[PDB]
RNA sequence: AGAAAAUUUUCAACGGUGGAUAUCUAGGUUCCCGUGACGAUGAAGAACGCAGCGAAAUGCGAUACGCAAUGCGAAUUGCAGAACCGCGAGUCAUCAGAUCUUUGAACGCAAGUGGUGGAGGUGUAAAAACCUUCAUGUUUGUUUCAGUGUGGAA
RNA sequence: GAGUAGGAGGGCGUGAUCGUUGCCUAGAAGUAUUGGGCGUGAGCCUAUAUGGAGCAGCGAUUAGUGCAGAUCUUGGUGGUAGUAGCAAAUAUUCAAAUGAGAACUUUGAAGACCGAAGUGGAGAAGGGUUCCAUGAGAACAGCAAUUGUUCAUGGGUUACUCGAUCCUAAGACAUAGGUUAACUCCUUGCAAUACAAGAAGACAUUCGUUUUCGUUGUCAAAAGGGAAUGAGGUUAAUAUUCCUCA
RNA sequence: ACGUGCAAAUCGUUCGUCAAAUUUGAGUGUAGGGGCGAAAGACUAAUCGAACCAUCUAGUAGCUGGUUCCCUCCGAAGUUUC
RNA sequence: CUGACCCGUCUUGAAACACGGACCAAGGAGUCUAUCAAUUAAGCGAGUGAUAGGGUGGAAAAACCCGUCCGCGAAACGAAAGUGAGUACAAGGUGCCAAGCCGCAAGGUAGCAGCAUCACCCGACCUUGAGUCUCCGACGAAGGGUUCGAGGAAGAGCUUAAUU
RNA sequence: CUACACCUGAAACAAGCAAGAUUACCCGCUGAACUUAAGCAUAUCAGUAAGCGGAGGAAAAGAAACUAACUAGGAUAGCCCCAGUAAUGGCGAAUGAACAGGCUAAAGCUCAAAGUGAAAAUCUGAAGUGGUCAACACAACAGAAUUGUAAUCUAAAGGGUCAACCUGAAACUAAGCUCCUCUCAUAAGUUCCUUGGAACAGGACGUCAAAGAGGGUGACAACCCCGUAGUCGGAGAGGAAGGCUGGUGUAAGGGAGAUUUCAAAGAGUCGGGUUGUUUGGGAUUGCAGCCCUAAGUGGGAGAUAAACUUCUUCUAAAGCUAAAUAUACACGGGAGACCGAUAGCGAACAAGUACUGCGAAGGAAAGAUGAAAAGAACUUUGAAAAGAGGGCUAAAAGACUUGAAACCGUUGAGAAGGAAGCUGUAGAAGAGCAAUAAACUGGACGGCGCAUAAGGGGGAAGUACUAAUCACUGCAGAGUCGAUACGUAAA
């Protein structure tokens, strides 16, 4: 232990010889995954690769501003779509029963998604018989033979261009932002003692 | 690669072996206790000893592979191509370009559909390429020493590299068995084929599709590249690389 | 080469060769057919048999022609009549030969042979 | 100039000791991929055997370096004798049917012992000798039973 | 123009990899040199001899990359040195024979020893073919050898009465029951820390039937207990065993 | 005496005891912080004031020893503080 | 003829009556992984760079393209609650001092980078406050510090290789 | 009291199950010291070695008594991040996760518990009958079972009442595909010279190449032989612990939505105390003993102990579950800037062998004649080994490739009065196919053989210039592609 350099942080203190991980399989592994995926396509041929995924906001204050692919559709949403979980599943839709909708907009996105899905759908019944729910589409669709990816057919755009208005500037200029944030933080701070005062002056 | 590690230990460590201790007029090294075998009392595991473990037994997890910044991979491939275009350089590499005409050497897609080998040969012969190919053929070496037992039997110098633009072209099957020929699809190119041995400049034969896509792929000092999606080629340090011109002009000498 | 399952290792192959079980050996030691026979059966090479007539193509004994006395697969040897050398005590001894240095002038003919030949010609011309 | 030899000693050539160097490799080593697939239907291991001439290693088990089936289609070979040209050679391969001594989780009991019980078979005038069979736990049942366990008609 | 500890700059030499230029059955690598030269030096080039299949330069890449030492590892060799030494256990000698050869083998003739507490005749433990016969190059039998406990080839170990096998001992182990994470461990002849555990008979002769009496295992002794054999003869090698007789 | 033995405890003389707490074979009971001991820290397979075998184990070493090619250049410290 | 103790080692001191070395061949000792830093070459620059993974591809584990996040930089000071580089038209002064321009010269002009110093700024700790409102807790015109900070004040980083 | 029934236990018998093996990876336990703190107790090494019990092809884990408090997310597992962060620690040494976010992978299901009570609707065996006969379908008779089998149900519901709209065991009947195993077949010089014992070498003429990977053939062979490539090709045989998809279609079976006096869910368990132990988990990280021992809008959780008010999230105390993940083990495949017989596994070889130890356990050395044995015929001297002749062979290369050093013998040239070697300087002798040397360049002229010179015209190609043309720079019309915090609610 000699010079000005930063205090070391021990690494190999235990017996690591038993505990090392090697990455050469990676090479072949990637490849394997490829073929797997491909062999899925072939065995699934008429149907799409990835099953239908709703969308939500991310779980953290910092992530809220972004968009994320959900695991499943909210029963509430399937209702507004008019699909039973079971059916949606026979369709290739992904359902999640513990998720709940606390916003109108979160219903909207997924409705739009579901509908979009259905509209673009082709359904093969036992040969030459037709059916009703989510319905069933004409025998000629058998010839249509669509191999498609879900991002192409059922996507989600957003562009950041924020529209400008002057009248509002005239408006917004009359308040004071700092003062605001301050008095607010303040209110949250002293709320408890204040309510307690109300209760105490009331009794 | 690495040296045997097993239940017993790193190789050479496979004895229960002691240090006799100072009293015996023998060295302190570990020996093998036991009876009845000539190996008995023989020095035990350590660098010094016949039949012992190495200085630094060599491991699997030695990190061999390195990763290059994309921009520098590209800049490299570029400067390589740049090189491939000047006669002095490819001649300097030892390629035989004498009967070759105009570099870059570009041809029609008539080539891309070649199937049999004979016509790829006839091709090289016409174009005057074949001289270079001849050379790969006339210097063919048995590898010096160990390499042979290691499954590399022959050292062959590199011949002409062709760059085709059509994904489905047969030029591949065509050139295959010709020693020294090298086939590449324009969209993905290797500094490794471009500058074998890190040695800049090489004989290339190009297609039309090849040659044309070159620009879309890379781009130019006006525009970015498409395929490289934002790659800008190197900004020259000196517009003119003749210091001749610059030392020898009016402005220079008036003042000098 | 096109196939990952094809061993390019000196070791593995040499091994295959010398570790060759008898039946495979017969294949491994085989001779080239005469212009005539080549043309007849549309087959380049054939595994040697003990009743065949052959011509030594290369060696101090090149140019000599005769019947195959012994296919000794273990010793890797083919023996040909009158290809022996004489010893000072007056004792004769055979001189062994590598098939791939031989040429088949006349085959021993019989059903199995004909079938083999037939298969070879078959993939060949077709 | 004890200006010869012997001894001691330098250098070279040849010879002798010795097995370095060079060049090889049916070996090792590491990496990636594929299958996990032993056993009371007796495993893994152990003992003793099995070739015309055989110790070992490998194979095999009284059908004993091997039977059968299948594919290759003429050898094995160190010696000797046969067999095979297709009724098919072979120290060939494949392997899906057989053989599988004494043992070993190891099993009637016992064991530094080929010792010794019961039942059945055999053998005999009767024996001897030979042969087959019997371990423990557990889930069902089957059959025969016990209980001052609970009930209980004639 | 000094220099240990130490540091810096250049260079020499060795594998292997990507390049580039080439050399080799018209003889590569390696090896020997009181042949000729090149570097201040790492080192180099050539010549001759040997050798009999691979080599080499240049630019980079990489390193199990340079040894006089560590009582360093493994292997091989010296001087000491034809030296120390081959001296306990009283002893040998003569002739013949055999053999290339005899102080060391075989017969005979002499002289001595162990002196029935043996250098004798047989066993147990331990050894495992060392036993018998014929033959014999090397090695071994610290001199020697024609000889052998050595080498090669063949052949030898017969039982109602000998012993093992049976019995019990000091002891020990199952079963049953209990303990343990589990493995393991605890009890058991005065038999149990267990216990619905057995044996016999007869008819039947299977079962079954039937009857009687009943708590329940095994191993440990080649000197202990312990049903009955002797003499004579025979083989190159076995015999209280084979043969004969009793 | 031998002490590079005949011998990792022997040999010559001499000596203790010699019908008992005598000598001795086999079988059987005791195993490592444990045995076993008329007690010497004795004995426990040439190992004992804690056997032997393998493993953790290349145990740690402020200490001893070694630390492998050339040239050229610069060139020390044995004092301060804790 | 002149000069010439035995090497290696530890030591103030070795030819030492200090230790290792009878001889020879082959073997034989600062590596490998990670970590931070300084320097050198590379790329890009208020950005930089992926990893995982996707997608293609040579016979082949290469290569070639994609890779919404992430790292590290881009803001700091506080234990923390918290605040944030305070006159929108700022980004300074001074002493040393380089280019360019003047001048034969003497010197004159200018003032980049760095060093020293003074000033301003954000935050910690102190101190002070008209007035304002969602008035009991916040806001803020004016005015300050003997102090504290791995900070502002026209961003210098990020990835790669090598050495110590 | 008997017969008999039922509960409980017992024996023999029939049919099936467990007992050991395996080591790399996996599960449940048990559990240290060396070492680091420069001492040393806590700590560290470390839940690590050793030990024990269980598996599998993977294991385990898994459908929330999870996160998070945000415009939330949503099984488990691996990768990347978060991170060397929060935390733990003689706050010393040193320990040290997770949420959010980017990916790989994707999957969800079965029980207990009011409800057959218009009727045990259930499960197991089964002489047997059909069969693809070991695997399937029925089955007389028997057991199990109301101290309860099967249908509904599992909170995402559900019962009850409607109901659009759906489904199909049985039987009958057509055509097919997937995967595995063992076999069989495929280009083109053996032309010519020279050196070789051998041509696979160096030359001359030829060929094939979706085959110039790699091997073997007396030598560094694409073309002599095996192979390689066309070949996820063609042909033949046998397979599925008895692979997979049709068409009619029976008894029967579902249910979006709608409504409704309905709506029921795991106990010595959860929770608490205490004591150990464990985790970063720190006055409630996990677990285990002992002592308490519940509830039913109850009960968990919301990273500080305890009340009290409000909000958030999930339903524990029963079960199943592919994939992405781990594999120093076994049998296979392929490969490598590995090693190359003191290296590489200890073992290239009758290597876990010979050998040693009472035993547990220890454990080596040892690879290359030649293309072919052609392995040395025969003569001679020897008792024999062997020598001398003679011979094989390209060569003895002869128990064997090369054949270094140390050491030893012979032959040669030298040298020495109680050691040797060595820097500097000369000399002598000895050994020699000799590495240095009076040569080289030119003028004029001569003798020889070959070519055609300078100078002059000429002026392809070259360079330089320069209008007309034309790359590039600049400007830039029309088409097609793209971008755009310009613009629109989007267009
Ligand atoms: Mg895997
Ligand atoms: Mg000593
Ligand atoms: Mg060619
Ligand atoms: Mg010599
Ligand atoms: Mg047959
Ligand atoms: Mg039983
Ligand atoms: Mg009763
Ligand atoms: Mg190496
Ligand atoms: Mg020659
Ligand atoms: Mg050189
Ligand atoms: Mg020669
Ligand atoms: Mg180099
Ligand atoms: Mg060396
Ligand atoms: Mg040495
Ligand atoms: Mg000696
Ligand atoms: Mg003596
Ligand atoms: Mg005697
Ligand atoms: Mg005696
Ligand atoms: Mg006797
Ligand atoms: Mg007793
Ligand atoms: Mg007892
Ligand atoms: Mg008796
Ligand atoms: Mg008798
Ligand atoms: Mg005495
Ligand atoms: Mg000290
Ligand atoms: Mg002197
Ligand atoms: Mg000396
Ligand atoms: Mg002195
Ligand atoms: Mg010392
Ligand atoms: Mg990558
Ligand atoms: Mg930051
Ligand atoms: Mg300033
Ligand atoms: Mg009962
Ligand atoms: Mg088991
Ligand atoms: Mg350690
Ligand atoms: Mg210490
Ligand atoms: Mg810990
Ligand atoms: Mg298994
Ligand atoms: Mg990290
Ligand atoms: Mg995530
Ligand atoms: Mg039946
Ligand atoms: Mg019943
Ligand atoms: Mg061919
Ligand atoms: Mg000739
Ligand atoms: Mg040729
Ligand atoms: Mg070849
Ligand atoms: Mg093929
Ligand atoms: Mg514990
Ligand atoms: Mg609590
Ligand atoms: Mg659960
Ligand atoms: Mg001779
Ligand atoms: Mg020779
Ligand atoms: Mg000499
Ligand atoms: Mg003399
Ligand atoms: Mg002298
Ligand atoms: Mg003299």
UniProtKB/Swiss-Prot annotation, chain A:
GO cellular component terms attached to this protein's record: cytosolic large ribosomal subunit
Single GO biological process annotation from the record: translation
Protein name per its UniProtKB record: Large ribosomal subunit protein eL13
Region (Disordered): 184-203
PROSITE patterns: RIBOSOMAL_L13E (PS01104)
Domain of life where this protein originates: Eukaryota
Keywords: Ribonucleoprotein, Ribosomal protein
Family, per entry: Belongs to the eukaryotic ribosomal protein eL13 family.
Pfam families: Ribosomal_L13e
Gene3D superfamilies documented for this protein: 6.10.250.1230
Positions with biased composition (Basic and acidic residues): 184-193
GO molecular function, a single term: RNA binding
UniProtKB/Swiss-Prot annotation, chain B:
Any single biological process term in GO: translation
Transmembrane stretches, start-end: none
One GO cellular component, as annotated: ribonucleoprotein complex
Coiled-coil region(s): none
Localization: Cytoplasm
UniProt KW Cytoplasm keyword: yes
Alphabetized UniProt keyword annotations: Cytoplasm, Ribonucleoprotein, Ribosomal protein
Molecular function as annotated in GO: structural constituent of ribosome
Taxonomy, superkingdom: Eukaryota
Similarity comment: family membership: Belongs to the universal ribosomal protein uL4 family.
Protein name per its UniProtKB record: Large ribosomal subunit protein uL4
Taxonomic classification: Eukaryota, Sar, Alveolata, Ciliophora, Intramacronucleata
Swiss-Prot record, chain C:
Listed InterPro entries: KOW, Rib_uL2_dom2, Ribosomal_uL24_CS, Ribosomal_uL24_euk/arc, Ribosomal_uL24_KOW, Translation_prot_SH3-like_sf
Short name of any one Pfam family annotated for the protein: KOW
Gene3D superfamilies: 2.30.30.30
Record field: transmembrane: none
Gene Ontology CC terms: large ribosomal subunit
A biological-process GO annotation: translation
SMART domains: KOW
Top-level taxon of origin: Eukaryota
Keyword tRNA processing in annotation: no
Disordered, as annotated region: 1-22
Gene Ontology MF terms: RNA binding; structural constituent of ribosome
Keywords: Ribonucleoprotein, Ribosomal protein
Entry annotated with the keyword Ribosomal protein: yes
Stated family: Belongs to the universal ribosomal protein uL24 family.
Identification of the protein by name: Large ribosomal subunit protein uL24
Originating gene: RPL26
